């Protein structure tokens, strides 16, 4: 709908930007307040750094993917500088939170709980026919009550037919990306399942980089031999065998997110 009819458009005067959380080539992320009292995150587009249409495409997708376990779109300001306003998550990205003192003291039970929360968000994305394509701990946000939500929908896509095929030139992080996507540019919800397995390693190692001591060509070489990531230090074997299911060679043999959520809940209610 046009901005004057859109439920998400808000006048820029309703926002006060207070603290800058991040700055990059395409813009900034700030903590701010909407109408004085409601804390929100605001992502601003650096004019000319990228297409405003590409930038807003993420917000349009978020209008269709609303769930408790996904960071919620709050509003948009479509006049330059363009803003996308979202739900504020007090503890920031999971990859950073797990390294703080509070994060370091978490029990394996709480880590399994957070893992199940993320699988629950991804089961919603699965059921709605979308894919995320950038699932990693950096893209999970943590609330003040230690609940987790899926974030960063820039690469997310509605999947009309089972598969999304990227651009031959498009590049993805090798350590988190499924083989079929690295090799063919083909993504399905099963590519996200692979990524989830890698994310589980990030959770259990308190944010360590996957495949320790290995370069990308080494990871590729090992995967092709049938090897998978070495058991992380202090990782429960039940969890490791769940990661292995996510890393099966054939995408169709990998589990669904609903299955992953169900097992992780059992692991938590047990621990």
Curated annotation (Swiss-Prot):
Its main location: membrane. There is a cross-link at residue 46 (Glycyl lysine isopeptide (Lys-Gly) (interchain with G-Cter in ubiquitin)). It is a lipid-anchor. Residues 15-268 form the Protein kinase domain. The modification Phosphotyrosine is found at residue 164. GO terms for biological process: B cell receptor signaling pathway; CD27 signaling pathway; cell surface receptor protein tyrosine kinase signaling pathway; Fc-gamma receptor signaling pathway; gamma-delta T cell differentiation; hemopoiesis; intracellular signal transduction; intracellular zinc ion homeostasis. The SH2 domain mediates interaction with SQSTM1. This is Tyrosine-protein kinase Lck. It comes from Homo sapiens. The lineage of its organism: Eukaryota, Metazoa, Chordata, Craniata, Vertebrata.
């Amino acid at each position: 709908k046009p901005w004057w009819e859109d439920e998400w458009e808000v006048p820029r005067e309703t926002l006060k930007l207070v603290e800058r959380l991040g700055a990059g080539q395409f813009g900034e992320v700030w903590m701010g307040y909407y109408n004085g009292h409601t804390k929100v995150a605001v992502k601003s587009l650096k004019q000319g750094s990228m297409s405003p249409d590409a930038f807003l495409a993420e917000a349009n997708l978020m209008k269709q993917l609303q769930h408790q376990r996904l960071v919620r779109l709050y509003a948009v300001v479509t006049q330059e500088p363009i803003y996308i306003i979202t739900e504020y998550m007090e503890n920031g990205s999971l990859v950073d939170f797990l390294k703080t003192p509070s994060g370091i003291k978490l029990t394996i039970n709480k880590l399994l709980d957070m893992a199940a929360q993320i699988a629950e968000g991804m089961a919603f994305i699965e059921e709605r026919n979308y894919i995320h394509r950038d699932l990693r701990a950096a893209n999970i946000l943590v609330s003040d009550t230690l609940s987790c939500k899926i974030a960063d929908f820039g690469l997310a896509r509605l999947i009309e037919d089972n598969e999304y095929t990227a651009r031959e030139g498009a590049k993805f992080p090798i350590k988190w990306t499924a083989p079929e996507a690295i090799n063919y540019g083909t993504f399905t919800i099963k590519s996200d399942v692979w990524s989830f397995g890698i994310l589980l390693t990030e959770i259990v190692t308190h944010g360590r980089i996957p495949y320790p001591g290995m370069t990308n060509p080494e990871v590729i070489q090992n995967l092709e031999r049938g090897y998978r990531m070495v058991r992380p230090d202090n990782c429960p074997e039940e969890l490791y065998q769940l990661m292995r299911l996510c890393w099966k060679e054939r995408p169709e043999d990998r589990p669904t997110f609903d299955y992953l959520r169900s097992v992780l809940e059992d692991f938590f209610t047990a621990t």
